[PDB]
Amino acid sequence: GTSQWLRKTVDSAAVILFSKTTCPYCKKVKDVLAEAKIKHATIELDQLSNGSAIQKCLASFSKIETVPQMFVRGKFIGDSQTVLKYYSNDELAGIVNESKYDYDLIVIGGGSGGLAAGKEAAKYGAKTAVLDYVEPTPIGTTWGLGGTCVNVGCIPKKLMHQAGLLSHALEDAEHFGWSLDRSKISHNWSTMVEGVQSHIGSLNWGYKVALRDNQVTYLNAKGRLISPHEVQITDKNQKVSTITGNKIILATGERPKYPEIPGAVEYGITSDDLFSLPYFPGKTLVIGASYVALECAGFLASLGGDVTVMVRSILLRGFDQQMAEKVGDYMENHGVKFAKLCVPDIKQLKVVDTENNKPGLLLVKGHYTDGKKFEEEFETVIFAVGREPQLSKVLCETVGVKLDKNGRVVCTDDEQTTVSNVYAIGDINAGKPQLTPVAIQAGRYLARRLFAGATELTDYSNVATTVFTPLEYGACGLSEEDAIEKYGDKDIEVYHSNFKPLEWTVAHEDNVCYMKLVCRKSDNMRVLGLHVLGPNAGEITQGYAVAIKMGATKADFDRTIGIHPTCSETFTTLHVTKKSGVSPIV
Amino acid sequence: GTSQWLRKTVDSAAVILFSKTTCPYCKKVKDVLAEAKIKHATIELDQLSNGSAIQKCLASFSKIETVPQMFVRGKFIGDSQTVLKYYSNDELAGIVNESKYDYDLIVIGGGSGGLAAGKEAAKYGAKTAVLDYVEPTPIGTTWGLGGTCVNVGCIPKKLMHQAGLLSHALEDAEHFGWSLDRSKISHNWSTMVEGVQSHIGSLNWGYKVALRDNQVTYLNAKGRLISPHEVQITDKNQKVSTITGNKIILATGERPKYPEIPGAVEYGITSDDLFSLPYFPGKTLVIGASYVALECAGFLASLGGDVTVMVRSILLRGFDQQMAEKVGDYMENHGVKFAKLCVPDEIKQLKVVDTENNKPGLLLVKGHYTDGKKFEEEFETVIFAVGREPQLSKVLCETVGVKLDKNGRVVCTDDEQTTVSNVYAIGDINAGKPQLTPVAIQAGRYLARRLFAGATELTDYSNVATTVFTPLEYGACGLSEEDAIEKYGDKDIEVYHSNFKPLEWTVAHEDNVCYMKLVCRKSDNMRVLGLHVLGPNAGEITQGYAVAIKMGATKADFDRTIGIHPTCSETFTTLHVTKKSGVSPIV
Numbered sequence A: 001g002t003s004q005w006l007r008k009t010v011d012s013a014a015v016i017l018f019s020k021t022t023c024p025y026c027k028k029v030k031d032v033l034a035e036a037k038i039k040h041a042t043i044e045l046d047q048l049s050n051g052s053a054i055q056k057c058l059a060s061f062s063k064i065e066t067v068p069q070m071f072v073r074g075k076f077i078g079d080s081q082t083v084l085k086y087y088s089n090d091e092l093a094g095i096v097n098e099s100k101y102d103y104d105l106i107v108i109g110g111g112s113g114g115l116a117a118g119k120e121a122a123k124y125g126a127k128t129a130v131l132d133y134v135e136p137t138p139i140g141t142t143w144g145l146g147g148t149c150v151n152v153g154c155i156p157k158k159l160m161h162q163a164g165l166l167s168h169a170l171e172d173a174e175h176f177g178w179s180l181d182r183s184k185i186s187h188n189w190s191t192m193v194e195g196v197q198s199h200i201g202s203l204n205w206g207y208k209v210a211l212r213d214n215q216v217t218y219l220n221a222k223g224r225l226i227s228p229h230e231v232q233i234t235d236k237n238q239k240v241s242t243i244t245g246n247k248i249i250l251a252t253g254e255r256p257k258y259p260e261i262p263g264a265v266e267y268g269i270t271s272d273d274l275f276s277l278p279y280f281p282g283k284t285l286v287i288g289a290s291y292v293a294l295e296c297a298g299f300l301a302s303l304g305g306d307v308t309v310m311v312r313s314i315l316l317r318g319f320d321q322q323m324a325e326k327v328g329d330y331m332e333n334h335g336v337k338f339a340k341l342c343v344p345d346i347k348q349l350k351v352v353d354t355e356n357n358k359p360g361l362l363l364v365k366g367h368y369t370d371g372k373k374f375e376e377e378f379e380t381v382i383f384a385v386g387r388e389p390q391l392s393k394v395l396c397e398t399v400g401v402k403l404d405k406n407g408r409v410v411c412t413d414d415e416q417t418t419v420s421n422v423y424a425i426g427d428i429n430a431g432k433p434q435l436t437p438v439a440i441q442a443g444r445y446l447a448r449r450l451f452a453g454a455t456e457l458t459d460y461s462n463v464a465t466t467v468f469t470p471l472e473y474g475a476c477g478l479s480e481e482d483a484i485e486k487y488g489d490k491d492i493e494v495y496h497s498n499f500k501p502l503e504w505t506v507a508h509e510d511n512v513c514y515m516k517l518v519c520r521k522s523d524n525m526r527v528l529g530l531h532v533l534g535p536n537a538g539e540i541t542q543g544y545a546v547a548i549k550m551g552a553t554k555a556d557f558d559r560t561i562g563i564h565p566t567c568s569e570t571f572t573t574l575h576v577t578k579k580s581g582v583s584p585i586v
Numbered sequence B: 001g002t003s004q005w006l007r008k009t010v011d012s013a014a015v016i017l018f019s020k021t022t023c024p025y026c027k028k029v030k031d032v033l034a035e036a037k038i039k040h041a042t043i044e045l046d047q048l049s050n051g052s053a054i055q056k057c058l059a060s061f062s063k064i065e066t067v068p069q070m071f072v073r074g075k076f077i078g079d080s081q082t083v084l085k086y087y088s089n090d091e092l093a094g095i096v097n098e099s100k101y102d103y104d105l106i107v108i109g110g111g112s113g114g115l116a117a118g119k120e121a122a123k124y125g126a127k128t129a130v131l132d133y134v135e136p137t138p139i140g141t142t143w144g145l146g147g148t149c150v151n152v153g154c155i156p157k158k159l160m161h162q163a164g165l166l167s168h169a170l171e172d173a174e175h176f177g178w179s180l181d182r183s184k185i186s187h188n189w190s191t192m193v194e195g196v197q198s199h200i201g202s203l204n205w206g207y208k209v210a211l212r213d214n215q216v217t218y219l220n221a222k223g224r225l226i227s228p229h230e231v232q233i234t235d236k237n238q239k240v241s242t243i244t245g246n247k248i249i250l251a252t253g254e255r256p257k258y259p260e261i262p263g264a265v266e267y268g269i270t271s272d273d274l275f276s277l278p279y280f281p282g283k284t285l286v287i288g289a290s291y292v293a294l295e296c297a298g299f300l301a302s303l304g305g306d307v308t309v310m311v312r313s314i315l316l317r318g319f320d321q322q323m324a325e326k327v328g329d330y331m332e333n334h335g336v337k338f339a340k341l342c343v344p345d346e347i348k349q350l351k352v353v354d355t356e357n358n359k360p361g362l363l364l365v366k367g368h369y370t371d372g373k374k375f376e377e378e379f380e381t382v383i384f385a386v387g388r389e390p391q392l393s394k395v396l397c398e399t400v401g402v403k404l405d406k407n408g409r410v411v412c413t414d415d416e417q418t419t420v421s422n423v424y425a426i427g428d429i430n431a432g433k434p435q436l437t438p439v440a441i442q443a444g445r446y447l448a449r450r451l452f453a454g455a456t457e458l459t460d461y462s463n464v465a466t467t468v469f470t471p472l473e474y475g476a477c478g479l480s481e482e483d484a485i486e487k488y489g490d491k492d493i494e495v496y497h498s499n500f501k502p503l504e505w506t507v508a509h510e511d512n513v514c515y516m517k518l519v520c521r522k523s524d525n526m527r528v529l530g531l532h533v534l535g536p537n538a539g540e541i542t543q544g545y546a547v548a549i550k551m552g553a554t555k556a557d558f559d560r561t562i563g564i565h566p567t568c569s570e571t572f573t574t575l576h577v578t579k580k581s582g583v584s585p586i587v
């Protein structure tokens, strides 16, 4: 147990010191390493439950049982007198840099998970390389370091959402006494895009500065794993070479899918192109019904656009379907048009006008599920029909890394693949929620286990979400239909209520915002799922995710007192059950 | 044990049925009571763990151990055959209305706590009266049903806060691509006040309708408790009379204080006056440093006003002082002036308020600083926010025997009972309790259930979360850092903290003013003793964490929970810089 932990920690740590906080010989070794700029992990034996057992087990490696003991890449280097001797003789720098491999860690992919993993590993003395390359979109769009969220995901989409929310703030301001006239104000797309891209540029630069300051090697190159320890890299000049590493983290993410229909790749775009587009999309069709499709259609409508969404079957498949339909009803009431039960079968009428900075024109042909025909003209067609990895480009078949039927990596609960030195994090890890804070937690926690002897695993259960549609939807835990399937209808109680934000009163809807708690009767009314549709839904939901993590019950919500006036306080006084049939309106 | 719970429940309930869900004889009695419009509490014995023992103890009152059993005001009425005998003999209505008192419950005070208590009690067949009267301010301001929060408190102040927040929404919109020019837009006070007052009027009306539909008697009259069961009421025509009640709930709240200086009552105003003021205050002085003072100064500045705050000593006494200073620093950088370590000596009138042309007067304020230097400056409006106090002499005759504390608030047990066994107190007048609207509502509803439905649940007053709605909002739950250090010692306290920047603030162009921290106890598994956040939407951020803190959250619970991105709140899930480390908290 302890001995198996100690052997795993010594084998994989790059530079590690076993120590006690009160030992002045240990302080002397710490000061020499700091002076020589040698980064390392430290384990303070006097602060661990079984320090005495670990101290004994160390002798199986070093033949001594005292502290300090310093190791480099699995090899005992010395005690205090010995480390000082190497320092005085100018031999220490060469010893701590001796390695069978070029790097202790190679990260393939410089996004949310990979950057987090690489920076954390470098803190413990691991010699680290992060590779990042952005293959251009079909029309040629590309961007800088930081991954999908930073460049073409959470960051620009929430800034554009905020631009949309400000339209209603302008409307509300007249009712609260301000002299403006909303009807005479218009929106400039390119001014917004320039501000969004200036912020993204500051993030690209900030990540390169962070890697430099952590002594991480950044290679803007495409990587391919060709054997367990060998990574083939390809240059911006197409120069090909091979680097070796002890541990490998795969962190390459996903890219958007296109449907296999004529004209889709040639004449449509995806979210990858939208957030830097130099002209306003104009009259727009969004094909798809994911959170990406609905978030983009939502802000485009608030910015003044003529927007239609083509839905094959349902909205937000995999989310609670009562809440999904309330999300869509709000958008349809506030200007978004929906072509329901419909799929596309794209023709070009005008080429994009780079001269005068204007979109082209397209004819879209499709059909409804009953066979009736769809035919209509649009200036822009955005496909949001899912995302996928392309691990065939990243991973030679002969390495032995197992994939599932969707092409994602099959991992143990510590992110290990079927190849013992190779790990995977983020969107390519099969069966995990595909979210930026999950990829960051996974990468930081894994680096600590590899290079600092940590044991803590990432917990992937009950991870909260928020969909940033024009009225936002936050959730944590099970949908109501999933709870009933798992436990049976008679064991599920649902408390629910409508509400009206106080900010909406003077601004003139009464009963559109909504929240519910899905509970298990036979387990002390445990809260299985929380759902809220309303303003600031992500800020509302986050704190409750801690309480659900700790096993909150309905009684825990009841005994906590509300903060007034807020939207969130409605969760503390819920009482109407769905079984009662009583109306949830206010 | 069980037996004296049953005794209390039977003595106190107005109309209560002991039942079982599968009993068809109980179903017939229920349906009879519903047809006759008789409201009542119900105890289903087949659902309580010791319902067997309760069945036995019922015999001590009724000499039977079967179900159903109906009681009215402590007297056994009958089983199924006997209840139906009374119904078809036209004898039931008289029996269920027989009472020694005019009412089962009299609530003195129609505000947050009193309206909640009265409505909940009526749901169980208690015959209930709610008394409310609003004594006018010195300049004559008055308002309708619903109490301090509804009329001159949480509701209008947060609406005026939102009007102020929309000024920065207008500035931000230009950076996000909208074509407006913020510099050419102005604010109209009276248009605001009309919208705010129209919403308050809808709440006044809604409460009157709610009381009518619950069969609660509403008396717009001043109440005075003259003996344990007698309440003297005074009419709008000065008519005096007396009504009697079994249980009494005191829920009369507080009103603003004035300093004892010349000119204060005559020429200044309070928050009672501000929210319906018919003219814009103009150049304004706020005297005091409570959350009322700072919230009001904040929105007046954001609406374009010239605003000064006169501070005797510190800001937000009783709140975390690191956070209080950050709140004030933001206000001073965004257009609120502060006269620090300063108190007033007199208000002199220079110009009388012009009712016709709808304009303020003009005043001269004289004061001095703590070192001895002098203060002298003219203002159009002077607002006093130097605390609030109850006036229980008006409400409560000394001979009744209800004990007060040295501040004049009612001394109560943990179930809100006073020193007089049938009299209870809730809300701001209950000594030692947090003075907040959702506390008063929970106390009132929970008390009503114990009195008339045999409930046992008490109100929990610990770790109640708060939010100060200053221009940059401040949310908190639990201990301040200084209180935790005093309680446990500095070596046993660890503080994790960080600055943050809302994503919404990036394109709009400050980096390091929003701030959050967790104050934790090392020797108790790093228990979270207090949570603090300064930033936008701070009440929405804080609320959910109050459930986790109620449940005993540790730092490890915050670490294992995953963030929602992009939000301000997610910064709580990845905190790692400690104050003891000396590492900077900036972004």
Ligand SMILES: Cc1cc2nc3c(=O)[nH]c(=O)nc-3n(C[C@H](O)[C@H](O)[C@H](O)COP(=O)(O)OP(=O)(O)OC[C@H]3O[C@@H](n4cnc5c(N)ncnc54)[C@H](O)[C@@H]3O)c2cc1C
Residues within 6 Å of the ligand: A108, A109, A110, A111, A112, A113, A114, A131, A132, A133, A134, A135, A146, A147, A148, A149, A150, A152, A153, A154, A155, A157, A221, A222, A223, A224, A251, A252, A253, A254, A271, A292, A393, A394, A425, A426, A427, A428, A434, A435, A436, A437, A439, B564, B565, B566
């Ligand atoms: C429109 C949109 C909105 C989103 N909004 C949110 C949101 O609000 N909240 C949220 O939590 N999540 C959101 N997400 C999801 C979030 O973007 C992802 O979960 C996250 O980016 C996954 O990080 P990752 O490290 O797994 O991969 P990525 O961030 O995609 O990083 C992988 C990187 O590796 C590079 N790469 C690929 N192949 C190679 C190779 N062979 N060699 C070198 N480099 C390579 C890629 O080009 C990329 O830069 C959104 C996603 C999209 C598309």
Ligand SMILES: Cc1cc2nc3c(=O)[nH]c(=O)nc-3n(C[C@H](O)[C@H](O)[C@H](O)COP(=O)(O)OP(=O)(O)OC[C@H]3O[C@@H](n4cnc5c(N)ncnc54)[C@H](O)[C@@H]3O)c2cc1C
Residues within 6 Å of the ligand: A563, A564, A565, B108, B109, B110, B111, B112, B113, B114, B131, B132, B133, B134, B135, B146, B147, B148, B149, B150, B152, B153, B154, B155, B157, B221, B222, B223, B224, B251, B252, B253, B254, B271, B292, B394, B395, B426, B427, B428, B429, B435, B436, B437, B438, B440
């Ligand atoms: C400016 C301001 C802002 C506030 N903001 C907030 C906030 O954001 N959040 C929050 O939680 N709290 C806030 N509060 C506090 C909140 O208003 C109080 O905690 C709450 O109103 C107290 O409720 P109560 O039932 O005890 O008394 P009240 O609501 O004051 O009701 C008592 C009622 O009884 C009446 N009455 C008095 N004497 C008699 C009598 N003899 N006969 C008949 N009727 C009588 C009073 O006139 C009044 O109508 C604020 C308070 C102020 C002043």
Ligand SMILES: Cc1ccc(CC(=O)NC[C@@H]2CCCO2)cc1
Residues within 6 Å of the ligand: A133, A136, A140, A142, A220, A221, A222, A234, A235, A236, A237
């Ligand atoms: C067509 C096109 C245009 C611009 C860019 C940006 C760039 O400079 N990419 C550098 C990578 C490193 C490996 C191959 O190219 C890429 C592709």
Ligand SMILES: Cc1ccc(CC(=O)NC[C@@H]2CCCO2)cc1
Residues within 6 Å of the ligand: A311, A313, A314, A315, A325, A328, A329, A332, A338, A340, A341
């Ligand atoms: C606005 C809006 C748009 C689209 C939808 C989805 C839809 O058409 N749902 C019906 C399906 C058929 C199978 C089960 O329910 C809802 C709401």
Ligand SMILES: Cc1ccc(CC(=O)NC[C@@H]2CCCO2)cc1
Residues within 6 Å of the ligand: B311, B313, B314, B315, B325, B328, B329, B332, B338, B340, B341
């Ligand atoms: C903007 C603003 C205004 C007022 C204050 C309070 C103050 O003046 N503090 C000085 C010393 C420190 C403790 C006692 O007084 C702070 C910040």
